[PDB]
Amino acid sequence: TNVSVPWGATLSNAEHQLIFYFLVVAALAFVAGFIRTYITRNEVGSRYRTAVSARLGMLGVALLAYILIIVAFLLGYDSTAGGWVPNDGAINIFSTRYIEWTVSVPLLTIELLAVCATLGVQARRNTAIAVTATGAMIFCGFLGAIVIDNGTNTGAFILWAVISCVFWVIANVVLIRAVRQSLPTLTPESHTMLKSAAIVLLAGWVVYPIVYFLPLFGASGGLTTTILITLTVADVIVKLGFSTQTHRVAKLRTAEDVRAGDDVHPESIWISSVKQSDAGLPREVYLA
Amino acid sequence: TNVSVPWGATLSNAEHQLIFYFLVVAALAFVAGFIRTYITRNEVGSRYRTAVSARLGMLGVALLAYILIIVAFLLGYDSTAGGWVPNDGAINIFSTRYIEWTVSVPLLTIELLAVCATLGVQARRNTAIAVTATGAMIFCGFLGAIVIDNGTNTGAFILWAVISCVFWVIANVVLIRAVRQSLPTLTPESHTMLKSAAIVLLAGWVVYPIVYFLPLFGASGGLTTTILITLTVADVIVKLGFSTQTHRVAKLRTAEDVRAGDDVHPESIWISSVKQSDAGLPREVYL
Amino acid sequence: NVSVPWGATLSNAEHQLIFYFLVVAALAFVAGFIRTYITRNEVGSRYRTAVSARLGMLGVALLAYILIIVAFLLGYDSTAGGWVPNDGAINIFSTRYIEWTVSVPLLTIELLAVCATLGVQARRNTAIAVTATGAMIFCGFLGAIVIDNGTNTGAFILWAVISCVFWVIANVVLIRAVRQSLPTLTPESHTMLKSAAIVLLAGWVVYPIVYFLPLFGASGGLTTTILITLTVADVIVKLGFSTQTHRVAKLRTAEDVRAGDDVHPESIWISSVKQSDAGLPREVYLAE
Amino acid sequence: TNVSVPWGATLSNAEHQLIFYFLVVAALAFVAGFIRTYITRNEVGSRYRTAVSARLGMLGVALLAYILIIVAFLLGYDSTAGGWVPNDGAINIFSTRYIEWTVSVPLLTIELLAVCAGVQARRNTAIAVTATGAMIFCGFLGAIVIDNGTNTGAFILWAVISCVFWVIANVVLIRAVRQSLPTLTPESHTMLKSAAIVLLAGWVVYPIVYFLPLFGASGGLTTTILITLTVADVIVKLGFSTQTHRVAKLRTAEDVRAGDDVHPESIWISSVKQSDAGLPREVYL
Amino acid sequence: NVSVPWGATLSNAEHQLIFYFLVVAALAFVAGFIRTYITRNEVGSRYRTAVSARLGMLGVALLAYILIIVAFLLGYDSTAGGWVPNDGAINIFSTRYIEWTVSVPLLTIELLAVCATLGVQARRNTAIAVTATGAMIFCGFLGAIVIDNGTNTGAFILWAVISCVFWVIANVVLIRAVRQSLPTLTPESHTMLKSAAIVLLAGWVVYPIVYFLPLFGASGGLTTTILITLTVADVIVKLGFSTQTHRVAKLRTAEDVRAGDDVHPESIWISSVKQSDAGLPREVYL
Ligand SMILES: *C/C=C(C)/C=C/C=C(C)/C=C/C1=C(C)CCCC1(C)C
Ligand SMILES: *C/C=C(C)/C=C/C=C(C)/C=C/C1=C(C)CCCC1(C)C
Ligand SMILES: *C/C=C(C)/C=C/C=C(C)/C=C/C1=C(C)CCCC1(C)C
Numbered sequence A: 001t002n003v004s005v006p007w008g009a010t011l012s013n014a015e016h017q018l019i020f021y022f023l024v025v026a027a028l029a030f031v032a033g034f035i036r037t038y039i040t041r042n043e044v045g046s047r048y049r050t051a052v053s054a055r056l057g058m059l060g061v062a063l064l065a066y067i068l069i070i071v072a073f074l075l076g077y078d079s080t081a082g083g084w085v086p087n088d089g090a091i092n093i094f095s096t097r098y099i100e101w102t103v104s105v106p107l108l109t110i111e112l113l114a115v116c117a118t119l120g121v122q123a124r125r126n127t128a129i130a131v132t133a134t135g136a137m138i139f140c141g142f143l144g145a146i147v148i149d150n151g152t153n154t155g156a157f158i159l160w161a162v163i164s165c166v167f168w169v170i171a172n173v174v175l176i177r178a179v180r181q182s183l184p185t186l187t188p189e190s191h192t193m194l195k196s197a198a199i200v201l202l203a204g205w206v207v208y209p210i211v212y213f214l215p216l217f218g219a220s221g222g223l224t225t226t227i228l229i230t231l232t233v234a235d236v237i238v239k240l241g242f243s244t245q246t247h248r249v250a251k252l253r254t255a256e257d258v259r260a261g262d263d264v265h266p267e268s269i270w271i272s273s274v275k276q277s278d279a280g281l282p283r284e285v286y287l288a
Numbered sequence B: 001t002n003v004s005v006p007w008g009a010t011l012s013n014a015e016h017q018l019i020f021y022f023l024v025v026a027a028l029a030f031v032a033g034f035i036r037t038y039i040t041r042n043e044v045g046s047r048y049r050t051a052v053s054a055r056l057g058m059l060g061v062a063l064l065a066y067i068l069i070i071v072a073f074l075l076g077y078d079s080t081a082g083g084w085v086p087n088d089g090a091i092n093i094f095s096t097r098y099i100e101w102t103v104s105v106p107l108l109t110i111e112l113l114a115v116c117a118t119l120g121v122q123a124r125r126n127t128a129i130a131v132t133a134t135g136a137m138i139f140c141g142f143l144g145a146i147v148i149d150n151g152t153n154t155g156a157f158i159l160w161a162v163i164s165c166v167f168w169v170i171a172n173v174v175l176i177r178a179v180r181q182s183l184p185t186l187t188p189e190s191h192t193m194l195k196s197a198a199i200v201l202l203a204g205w206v207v208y209p210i211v212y213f214l215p216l217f218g219a220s221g222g223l224t225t226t227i228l229i230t231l232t233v234a235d236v237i238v239k240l241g242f243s244t245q246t247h248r249v250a251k252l253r254t255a256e257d258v259r260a261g262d263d264v265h266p267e268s269i270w271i272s273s274v275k276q277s278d279a280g281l282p283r284e285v286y287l
Numbered sequence C: 001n002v003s004v005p006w007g008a009t010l011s012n013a014e015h016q017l018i019f020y021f022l023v024v025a026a027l028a029f030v031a032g033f034i035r036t037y038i039t040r041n042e043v044g045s046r047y048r049t050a051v052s053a054r055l056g057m058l059g060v061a062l063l064a065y066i067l068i069i070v071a072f073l074l075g076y077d078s079t080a081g082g083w084v085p086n087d088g089a090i091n092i093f094s095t096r097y098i099e100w101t102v103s104v105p106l107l108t109i110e111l112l113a114v115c116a117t118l119g120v121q122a123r124r125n126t127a128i129a130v131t132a133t134g135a136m137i138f139c140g141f142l143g144a145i146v147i148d149n150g151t152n153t154g155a156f157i158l159w160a161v162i163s164c165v166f167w168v169i170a171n172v173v174l175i176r177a178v179r180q181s182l183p184t185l186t187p188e189s190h191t192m193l194k195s196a197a198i199v200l201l202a203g204w205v206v207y208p209i210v211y212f213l214p215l216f217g218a219s220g221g222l223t224t225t226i227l228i229t230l231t232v233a234d235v236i237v238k239l240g241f242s243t244q245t246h247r248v249a250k251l252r253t254a255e256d257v258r259a260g261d262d263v264h265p266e267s268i269w270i271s272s273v274k275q276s277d278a279g280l281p282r283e284v285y286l287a288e
Numbered sequence D: 001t002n003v004s005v006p007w008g009a010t011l012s013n014a015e016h017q018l019i020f021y022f023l024v025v026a027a028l029a030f031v032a033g034f035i036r037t038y039i040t041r042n043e044v045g046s047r048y049r050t051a052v053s054a055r056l057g058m059l060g061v062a063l064l065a066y067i068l069i070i071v072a073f074l075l076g077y078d079s080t081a082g083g084w085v086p087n088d089g090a091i092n093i094f095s096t097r098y099i100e101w102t103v104s105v106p107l108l109t110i111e112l113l114a115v116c117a118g119v120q121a122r123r124n125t126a127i128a129v130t131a132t133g134a135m136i137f138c139g140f141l142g143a144i145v146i147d148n149g150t151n152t153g154a155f156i157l158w159a160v161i162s163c164v165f166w167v168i169a170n171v172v173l174i175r176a177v178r179q180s181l182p183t184l185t186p187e188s189h190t191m192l193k194s195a196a197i198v199l200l201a202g203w204v205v206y207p208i209v210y211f212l213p214l215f216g217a218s219g220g221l222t223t224t225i226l227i228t229l230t231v232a233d234v235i236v237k238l239g240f241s242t243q244t245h246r247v248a249k250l251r252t253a254e255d256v257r258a259g260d261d262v263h264p265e266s267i268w269i270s271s272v273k274q275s276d277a278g279l280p281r282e283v284y285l
Numbered sequence E: 001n002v003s004v005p006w007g008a009t010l011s012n013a014e015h016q017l018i019f020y021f022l023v024v025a026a027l028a029f030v031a032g033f034i035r036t037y038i039t040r041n042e043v044g045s046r047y048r049t050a051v052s053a054r055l056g057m058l059g060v061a062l063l064a065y066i067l068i069i070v071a072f073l074l075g076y077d078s079t080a081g082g083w084v085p086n087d088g089a090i091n092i093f094s095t096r097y098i099e100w101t102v103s104v105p106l107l108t109i110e111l112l113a114v115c116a117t118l119g120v121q122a123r124r125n126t127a128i129a130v131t132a133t134g135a136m137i138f139c140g141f142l143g144a145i146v147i148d149n150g151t152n153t154g155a156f157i158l159w160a161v162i163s164c165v166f167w168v169i170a171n172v173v174l175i176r177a178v179r180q181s182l183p184t185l186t187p188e189s190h191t192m193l194k195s196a197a198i199v200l201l202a203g204w205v206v207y208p209i210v211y212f213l214p215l216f217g218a219s220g221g222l223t224t225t226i227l228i229t230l231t232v233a234d235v236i237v238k239l240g241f242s243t244q245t246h247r248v249a250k251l252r253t254a255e256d257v258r259a260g261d262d263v264h265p266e267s268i269w270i271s272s273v274k275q276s277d278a279g280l281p282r283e284v285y286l
């Protein structure tokens, strides 16, 4: 049992405050993001609408999830003379974040695949692999960290982490292939953006596995705090800052389809205060 | 008596965690689905809007229902240090799922019937039968499993299950007939989709009856866990993965009506990244 | 003495059934509310009052039934196979009255909206119906719950009689409005409105009947019958009957389109049969 | 004479039920109103949209406010042998309504001023908002804040100060209506005047209910005060809400008929068509 | 050494006033949020970022003030001496920081969005402003609450100074962005942006001032002043100032319409004066 469960460490009043601060800030940040995404939903064409639906979903899930995390945090610790002593529900705080990831990660995959121009059959199978892979990845981590022996078995904590890494590789491969296959077809401007979005979205992922193995280096009120805050900052940075990257690709791809004369969009599309497309209406049709 | 109520079995800390995980994940999955369905609502024409309304409703019901299920689970169990001992309200967890099905299943019927080209009163009669049948199917199961003798009576548990199966057959027949009657009128591409949707939507149903009869083979923390999780996974797989099927049919049927020149749609309709219809605006009218 | 229903003890089976129907009802309204909202632009500006009223009714019902459910959960205490009523049990019955007070009046407006009543004639009718319906429920509430904690037989009867007076006033005005409008409407519209009017008003009888049941004694079974019957009645009326009014509005909209009186942006379909074709208002060049 | 705080009176089980009934009914009535206002938001042009925004806001504030009032009522009283005995939180019920008025009243001003006709319009809005805001705050200070509302002197003094603000508000609005009436069409002229009169008249009820506690305290009086205010809030904030909207719609239809601007959908008032549907002329850039 | 405000006992009158302003504020935001949402299509696609930012800020404020209200209700206990602070009283002050952490940054984006800085320069400007404003509040939270439960006078001041450094960085970038954009804008537009920039930035001073009040001692009256003043400040800025940014966007939209740069579906009206007439995009063949 070389594993030192983080929900066992007692927290200082200062630490307790910091965790709460970041958790709520995150939740509010998602509310702001969710609102933005919704209002800026018709800035994209019908073809890439799946990208908008996915991100809005991810943000929605994150908001509600972080509300549960906050609740668990409030019911997970009790105030004493020595600070905030963990109770039976403390484990729920860590558990809830996994739930978030289980649904959030898969949706991200779809978002990237949505902006990716993979056509017909190749695309459908890719989606299934990515979703199942990402879903399994988090489930394996949850099993090892929380489900098995109340996360007290050192070997499983590692074994399942390795199994998860397997899925992480499967996911990255499929996505990277899809991005690589689509890059040549896109315009130079589009090509650069997709690659940029793909790299930004996948890079951050490493932080999560790193934070997962931190408990092995021992237990501490400070460590527990670091684990929670780091993960929170990571969730916000990725699920928020990276959210715009996918959207931008969709918008440009939309404007390009307009300029190219492939389709007509109701409103002018602007990126970085530069006009990419002009407002257009479909030609009136007289039915038989 | 041979019936071993699942809400009587004690659950391990691991089991308790797993159940919670799947329940919440499911609820969140529905929120994501509900959001998607809403945003992708104008991708369909006015003719097949009933399909969109039904699915969004089903998802909405599921979301709220699973919230109740989750709450009951949290307020339905207590920790004894030997696991989680059921409260008097734990039965509510199982009860709530029935409530979900009672409202959710009927809406599904309407959704399939909506994509179906069955028109006139004959189709209206079909809707009434499907809804009433599906509604009764779940109610009969609820009566036997929970209402009668607090689910301690083996006779009712089975009798009512059989009565329910009767309704299940009535529902499947009407729906299958409606799909079969509509299939010939639809285009080849549309024909394939409806059949596909019909098969996928109806097939899964079998899982529910199977899980219902599991308690007869005894009671255990593991079994109780299997029952709950399996049903949850089933609900998500059907109410979600199967939801897209109906929507796609509606979109294509809309695009076809556009191409055929029968009707006009404001935006281009894309399926599988392949354009099915082009942007169109109705002719300006003078009075 | 009047045998108050909130005094009778309920079996575990009975308690479960009541909960089942209450929640199912609430969820049914959520499904209805969602449908009504999505299918709001299927109607013209002229009959929008009908849409606003139904969506309102459904919204009120949903929230109301949530309160009813809460009251039900806090109104009874478990005693090993039996549920003994507490001081809050009365609230369950009280809450339904609140629902009716707001819900019934909105229904009136909905029917009157689809009705062809023009000018003041229409406005006057609405005022009478709303005030009448509003008072009818209030009178019942006073006799059944407010006066002597609902234990006075004389008041229970007196106020019910007063209520019936208002019920007659309401039915008369509405029936007249429907009868006056039927001749002007098309055959297809005539059938729907008449059907809606008849369907909407007929069910009302059930409510008064259930009200006087307590007089014939008190029992766990009776109390169960009262609650469930009212719930089934609320759902059947507020839901199944909701479509009837909406359909009239849609057809009346399509008729206005075909007749060339007005233009609708999208095609209107009833029972899979096209009633109207998509039309756009003629572009106008303002003086500028 | 003597100020007798209403949150001191014990309430009967019957009284407790009545108050709950009206409070919830009111809240639900606002939900129904809020939904209607939202659905019937595009029935008005861009010029008078401030009227729609204001009313929807007022209704929204009222709904949430009445939710707090209901909560306070549930946590403000404890059930006893003699009925429902007030606790420390009972005062919150009365306090919450003031909060509602402080935000709700100002929005109403904007709504009427929105339908009303330049630069001096902005000044008028500032006066109305500040005046209305202060009027309620002054009453709050005297009735609740000062000496826990047990002082007859302030209860009256501050009421008088408030009345001063009430006069300022009514004057600005009355002037705005009077100044605008001549410019508007006869049909529009009648509407605005009608709306102005209906919106301002009711206000008197609030001050009247305020001074009732002076004539003593009782479970019945406390009940009368609460219910009357509730009925008043619903009647004004709801029935009166339509008045402003109608003016906006007609003024929109007039702009359409006159050819000044175009509206996408047909505008109907009293089951009578005011404007036929129109789309803006396609523009090349 | 620092007299924490959550240590002072409050009178029944004081307790009532704080509650009054807090709720009024929350409701004011609800009214604002509703208005902003309904008046979202009064602006063009080009300046939509401004609308998205303000609606977000208002949304955050509303929810935040709900938490502040809850904390206030669970932070004090009624006694014979008035309302005695408990362990949760500190949360009231803590929650406001959370609000500011998300609210302030969004404001920056809103002003920068109306600002015409083009290319990465605006994106670079955005990143600095967001991070600067974010850090500013975090530093204050650290010193006021996190460090020694706000009992260390040196930190209370040190971190305040560090924060002020960030405040200067933020003001500079924004002022530069406004100054750089001002020349490109029309005279009418130019005036509004400057006014909005000045109005948005000026108020900021109040917050730092209120922060250092606890140093001059602790009291039920002072605690009351701190809370109410901040609340009034939040509403006045986040609300009254919200319109300023929006108005600029609307005019800039109308100008683009008149100039023939873009087409807007509906007429745009500011102060009851028509700025742009309704226009529909030309139907296109593919
Ligand atoms: C929006 C949130 C995201 C993208 C979260 C991602 C999380 C991971 C990539 C987690 C991966 C893990 C491993 C590869 C090994 C250890 C267990 C996990 C689940 C933390
Ligand atoms: C979205 C959820 C769905 C479609 C659930 C379906 C459930 C059934 C088809 C249940 C059928 C049953 C029987 C035929 C016998 C035993 C009792 C039931 C209700 C489980
Ligand atoms: C959505 C619910 C509806 C339309 C409910 C209608 C209820 C009534 C018509 C009630 C009438 C009553 C009497 C005429 C006498 C006894 C008391 C009442 C209120 C139940």
Ligand SMILES: *C/C=C(C)/C=C/C=C(C)/C=C/C1=C(C)CCCC1(C)C
Binding pocket: D101, D104, D105, D108, D135, D136, D137, D138, D139, D140, D159, D160, D162, D163, D166, D203, D204, D206, D207, D210, D233, D236, D237
């Ligand atoms: C929507 C609610 C409205 C318009 C409420 C209005 C309230 C008043 C006009 C109150 C006025 C008062 C006085 C003039 C004196 C006493 C104190 C007040 C605030 C009740």
Ligand SMILES: *C/C=C(C)/C=C/C=C(C)/C=C/C1=C(C)CCCC1(C)C
Binding pocket: E100, E103, E104, E107, E136, E137, E138, E139, E140, E141, E160, E161, E163, E164, E167, E204, E205, E207, E208, E211, E234, E237, E238
């Ligand atoms: C919408 C709310 C706003 C803009 C709040 C602004 C707050 C500040 C400008 C705070 C600045 C501070 C310092 C510069 C020093 C002391 C600590 C702070 C955070 C209060």
